[PDB]
Amino acid sequence: AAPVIKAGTATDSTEAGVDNVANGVKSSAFGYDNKAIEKESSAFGTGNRATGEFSSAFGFHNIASKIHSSAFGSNNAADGVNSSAFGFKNTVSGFNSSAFGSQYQVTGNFSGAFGMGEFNGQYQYKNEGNNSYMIGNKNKIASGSDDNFILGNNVHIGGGINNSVALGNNSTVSASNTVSVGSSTLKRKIVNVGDGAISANSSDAVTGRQLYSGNGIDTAAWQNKLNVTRKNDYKDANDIDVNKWKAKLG
Amino acid sequence: AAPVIKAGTATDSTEAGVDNVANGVKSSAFGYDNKAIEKESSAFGTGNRATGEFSSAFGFHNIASKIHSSAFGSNNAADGVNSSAFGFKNTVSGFNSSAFGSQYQVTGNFSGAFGMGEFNGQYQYKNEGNNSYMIGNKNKIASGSDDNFILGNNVHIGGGINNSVALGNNSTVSASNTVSVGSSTLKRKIVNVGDGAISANSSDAVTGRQLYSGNGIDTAAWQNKLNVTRKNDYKDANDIDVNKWKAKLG
Amino acid sequence: AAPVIKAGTATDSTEAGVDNVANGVKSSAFGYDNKAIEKESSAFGTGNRATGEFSSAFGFHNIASKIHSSAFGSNNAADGVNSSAFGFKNTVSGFNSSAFGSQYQVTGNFSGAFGMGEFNGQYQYKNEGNNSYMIGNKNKIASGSDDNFILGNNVHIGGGINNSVALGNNSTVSASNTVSVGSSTLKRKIVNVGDGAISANSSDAVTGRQLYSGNGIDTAAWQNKLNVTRKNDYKDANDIDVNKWKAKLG
């Protein structure tokens, strides 16, 4: 009866608290209903499970099940090699993926998420992309869409969208190799942009002052796309028809 | 005397260490001066307090006080439902909000912060916005300004600024639905921008090469805003006054 | 024999588990081969070391060695004042710096990293910049380059690059006070940009529609950079040479 300290079912296995189970070699189970099943597995807290080697489950109802799993917080389940699940009810099912926040699931490989999702009975906002990171609330990435970075809320990415970045609240991305600043309804302005580098090859973002003034433009190409009349040949009568100009002008 | 294991004041309550207090049902208090007051509350470390149900306080002088609070690290106080405070002296006072770093306070709802702030005797850099996330050092968001994302240092947002994103060090935002890349003193250039989609409705970011060359421009609208003379009617004498042109030209 | 509870070598020092060492005042060592050497140092888990005052080492093979160090997870070594190392094999060697993820090292001051790196026998992706934050996989920042923010993967910053931000996968930055959206090989488009503010001083990002239409341009400056002929003086014969125009036109 009462809390007690005793050896588990394996060598160097420690059970501390009430109704604790330690089965792995060099494992430790501290708290109430804490299970340490694999070798060098530490499970500290209340109702925590450590079913993987070298796995750590700290907090409340945390689950670790792979070779290096860290489940710190409340109701987090880190099921992935070298994966970390931190916060409240964060599920990581990928490889070398991390997740910090509340009610977020990351099933992608080498992926990550930092924000708040939603969990009624299932995860409605999940990260299924590889090498993809999300920072925001209620953001979704479809499976097969990789190398996507989200900085915003209520951002959803469809299938087959690679190398895309979405910035701002309610951002929407619909193509690959693009950076989205907003949706079709709300469009954000880019303020305090540096001076451009107008040239034939330079690829910068021009400013309103440059377009207002037109410094550095091609004075020859622009004079052909729009048919303009330079002041010199007007003053000098160059490129003038003479057979019918003499008719109207007598 | 000495460290001892014993039952607390409730059923299935475990006190481990020296001067430990466990009052909640199914609670555990491990370490020195560790207090577990609510049901299924785990407080591990030195001088940690767990005053909320299902709350976990791990580390040094960590405080948890709500239904799902995670206070991991040093001097962190997570006071919020489903809120997580990780790092050194991080205070979370919002709902479903997370905070990782040092000396940062997040009072917003569904908000977050990842960086370094300042705490002399009070938090001088705090997040008071809803659905707002900060990544950087010494960043401030005023109350009432929501859906704001900061990626930079020394960035301050005033009141009534929504849907704004600030990028880069020393960035400044002064309007809603805008993305700031810098301040009035330093302006950053946007480099390696993709080719534009010049049209009547398309809203992209043009490049220096496009403005240099002018491909895809409206050859009719641009020829009216600037009064230009096309080469065809000059060659053909169209739209010519005849009553007074005959005077100067004889 | 077996797990036991006993006092350490200092006042209020608690050793729990098998082969645990507690030498600091008010320290606690819980688990297997857990060492708490400094005052108020807590080391919970398997093979964890707490060699700094007020330091917390939780998890598996975690090391804390400064005045406020948090090493939570697997194989994390937080060597820095007010520094936090969370995840799997994260090393923090800076001051007030945090690191969350797997196989990432942060040697910068007030710096941070959130992502996945690489550790064969040494850290190949490290953050050596001050006040710099990285979010992505396999990203590198050279020493001396400060105030740099990275949101992407496979992004490397050379020496002497300050106030630079890189967005997107495979982004490349080569200058200071610039924002990079891509590399010389892949260039990303900026989509859904708000309407510009064309003026003499305003510095915004223009859209394709504005350049297509040319609203708000300088009708006087643009008519001098490109020599154009306004329709009024053509209709009115102003600025016309008369001594030699009478020759070709008779």
Numbering used by the authors:
A (entry chain A), B (entry chain C), C (entry chain B): 25 to 274
Article excerpt on this structure:
The fusobacterial trimeric autotransporter adhesin (TAA) CbpF binds to CEACAM1 on immune cells, resulting in downregulation of their activity against tumors colonized by F. nucleatum. In contrast to Fap2, CbpF is a homotrimeric type Vc autotransporter protein, in which all three protomers together form a trimeric passenger domain that remains exposed on the cell surface after expression, and a C-terminal β-barrel domain that serves as a membrane anchor. The ECD of CEACAM1 comprises an N-terminal, membrane-distal immunoglobulin variable region-like (IgV-like) domain and three membrane-proximal immunoglobulin constant region-like (IgC2-like) domains IgC2-like A1, IgC2-like B, and IgC2-like A2. CbpF binds to CEACAM1 via a protruding loop (D142–Y149) and via H92 on the respective adjacent protomer chain.
